[PDB]
């Protein structure tokens, strides 16, 4: 009863999100977006591998769920339940519509055709661009060949063309590896639960010394 | 039997066949809608001005 | 709605030509006169065979009527007319609205 994804693959309509004018939609079949050692710190997992899109299209929430499951199940069994942190980097917010017709013999008697053809919600999708990141998994350099395979397996669950890119940044950071290293050798960097805070040369000095004292103790 | 409801197709071609002329501008335009308190004085002022020029080059 | 029974407003009676106290009532049409030219004509036209010769209206759509006030000046007894918007309920005897009082 689920209509195939070729019917909702391409961005033909405007964004149609759940709001106070739609008000009646199904829930996403994907609900988990962070897997693995999501509580890990930034120094534990330097390497980042992205699965990015090379086509302007829509991705079904159930396709996202399937890819997430396949990747996690491969990488857990091979490397371990805590050797990676995987992040789904796109969220399904666009609601897809279906105008449901009668599939019975004798239907033209009732269907009314394309009259009142504005459809009803039956699914969700994520709109992705070219160069847009779909999945992002961070690991140690020892586990590159496992996450690359886990994402290469996930690719079969999506439509279109997806590339696997090794990022020059430190994990999920916007900084390159040597830049983050030369900022952590000094005390600009301060870990949080999962992500990290950086010292700025702006702001009050009392607070920037209350935090980051290792930078000033020169 | 439905039909075509509306289109502005061909209307610019039609208008520009003999079209978008500015209406025109004259000297001494209408005093229509102008304040009557101003019109009432302008009448008398013009009367006096005509009288004065007449008596001047009389 | 509610309108007062008295109203100070302009009178054109050739002696006041100014604001004056007016007594207010509600206008009522008046009984249709025989010997009016239209009724004479219509009765002549309905006399005999042919049946109903003029139209007769049925497609009533408005529930309300505009309410018209007759404003009688107490000095010269010149009465004026002024009409209101459409209102399902209308009242002259005014028990005013009071803010602080409780339900």
């Amino acid at each position: 009863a689920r209509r195939p994804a070729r019917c909702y693959r391409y961005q033909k309509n405007k964004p149609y999100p759940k709001s106070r004018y739609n008000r009646a939609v199904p829930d996403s079949k994907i609900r988990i977006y962070d897997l693995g050692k999501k509580k890990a710190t930034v120094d534990e997992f330097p390497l980042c591998v992205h699965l990015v899109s090379n086509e302007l299209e829509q991705l079904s929430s159930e396709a996202l769920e399937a890819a997430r499951i396949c990747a996690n199940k491969y990488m857990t069994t091979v490397s371990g339940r805590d050797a990676f942190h995987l992040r789904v980097r796109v969220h399904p917010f666009h609601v897809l519509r279906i105008n449901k017709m009668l599939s019975c013999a004798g239907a033209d008697r009732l269907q009314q055709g394309m009259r009142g053809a504005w459809g009803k919600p039956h699914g969700l999708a994520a709109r992705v661009d070219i160069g847009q990141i779909i999945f992002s998994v961070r690991t140690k350099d020892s586990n590159k060949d496992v996450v690359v395979e886990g994402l290469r397996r996930a690719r079969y669950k999506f439509p279109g063309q997806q590339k696997i890119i090794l990022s020059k940044k430190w994990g999920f950071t916007n900084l390159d590896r040597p830049e983050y290293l030369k900022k952590r050798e000094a005390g600009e960097v301060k870990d949080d639960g999962a992500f990290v805070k950086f010292l700025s040369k702006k702001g009050s000095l009392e607070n920037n010394i209350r935090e980051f004292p290792e930078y000033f103790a020169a | 039997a439905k039909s075509k409801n509306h289109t502005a197709h061909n209307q610019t071609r039609k208008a520009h066949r003999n079209g978008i002329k500015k209406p025109k501008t004259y000297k001494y335009p209408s005093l229509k809608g102008v304040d009557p308190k101003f019109r009432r004085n302008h009448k008398h002022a013009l009367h006096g001005t005509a009288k004065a020029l007449a008596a001047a080059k009389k | 709605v509610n309108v007062p029974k008295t109203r100070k407003t302009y009178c054109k009676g050739k002696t006041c030509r100014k604001h004056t106290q007016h007594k207010v009532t509600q206008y009522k049409a008046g009984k249709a006169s025989l010997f009016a030219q239209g009724k004479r004509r219509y009765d002549r036209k309905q006399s005999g065979f042919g049946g109903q010769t003029k139209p007769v209206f049925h497609k009533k759509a408005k529930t309300t009527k505009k309410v018209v006030l007759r404003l009688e000046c107490v000095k010269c007894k010149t009465r004026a007319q002024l009409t209101l918007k459409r209102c399902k309920h209308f009242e002259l005897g005014g028990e005013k609205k009071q803010k602080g009082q409780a339900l």
Binding site: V52, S167 | K14, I20, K22, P23, V34 | -
Partner: protein, 159 residues
């Protein structure tokens, strides 16, 4: 059903501004408008009286009448295959002088000054403006400015 009212499709146009809500400064009311003055129309949404129709937003017209609180503006409006002249009675909050006429009259008096200055010696003022001409010959030195050779860069990911 359809809807074509007076203030239809005016949501963002008769919006006031960001951080400029409230009352209007007094220069709007202390400005002075004479007949023949050219004025642009920009409706203030906080003054609901004397407003223009949305058609006249961003329209420039000429004053034809002056009253207590309002100003009479003439506008030219395209109606089919012709222009019709339209008379608006607009409060001055929706009205400001056009700076184009001021910048033209400054040039007028400047040209008059130039003409009077150069008629004392007859040197062919040539007062007309001219477009930006092509640039003339010149010489470019390499003293301290030796050419820096460049090349296309290869492809990298940068993510």
């Amino acid at each position: 059903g359809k809807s074509h009212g007076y203030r239809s499709r005016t949501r963002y146009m008769f919006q006031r501004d960001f951080r400029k809500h409230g009352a209007v400064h007094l220069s709007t009311y202390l400005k002075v408008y004479k007949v023949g003055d050219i004025v642009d129309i920009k409706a203030n949404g906080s003054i609901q009286k004397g407003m223009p129709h949305k058609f006249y937003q961003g329209k420039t017209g000429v004053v034809y009448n002056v009253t207590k609180s309002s100003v009479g503006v003439i506008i030219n409006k395209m109606v089919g295959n012709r222009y019709l002249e339209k008379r608006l009675n607009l409060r001055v909050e929706h009205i400001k002088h056009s700076k184009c006429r001021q910048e033209f009259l400054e040039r007028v008096k400047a040209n008059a000054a130039k003409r009077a200055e150069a008629k004392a010696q007859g040197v062919a003022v040539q007062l007309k403006r001219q477009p930006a001409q092509p640039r003339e010959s010149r010489i470019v030195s390499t003293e301290g400015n030796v050419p820096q050779t460049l090349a296309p860069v290869p492809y990298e990911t940068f993510i």
